[PDB]
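User: Last request for today: this protein with magnesium ion, please.
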Amino acid sequence: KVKLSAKEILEKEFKTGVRGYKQEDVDKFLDMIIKDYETFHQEIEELQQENLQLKKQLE
Amino acid sequence: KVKLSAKEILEKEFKTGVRGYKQEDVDKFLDMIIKDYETFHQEIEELQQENLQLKKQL
Amino acid sequence: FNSREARRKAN
Ligand SMILES: [Mg+2]
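Assistant: Here's the final one, the structure of the complex with magnesium ion:
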C-alpha cells in the first residue's frame, strides 16, 4: 500500500554531507508534501465513508 | 487541494551548500514519496468511480 | 514541532 505517512516524513532525519541539498530548500518542499499526504488521507476517508453510506442505503 | 505531483517532485531542483542533506538519501526518499502519490491517486480514483456507480443505483 | 522548517530554524 502506501509506504510513508505524514508523520514519518515530518520526523525523517537525513544525514549530511559535502554539497548536500540545502536544508531549507528540502524542508520547505517536504512540508508541502506533508500537507498533501494529509489532504490525500482526508479525501480517502471522506470517500470511504460516503461509499459505506451509499452501500447501506442500497440494502 | 493537492499542491504537488509526481512530475513536480521530479522537476524540483534544490540548491546545494558547502554541507547539506546527503543527496542520495533525499532522492531515495523522494522516490518513495512519488510512488505514494501514485497510490493515493489510484485509491481515490477507484473510490470515486465506485461512489459514482453507487450513486447511479440510488 | 508541526513543520520540518520550524524544527530546522529552531535547530
Ligand atoms: Mg533543537
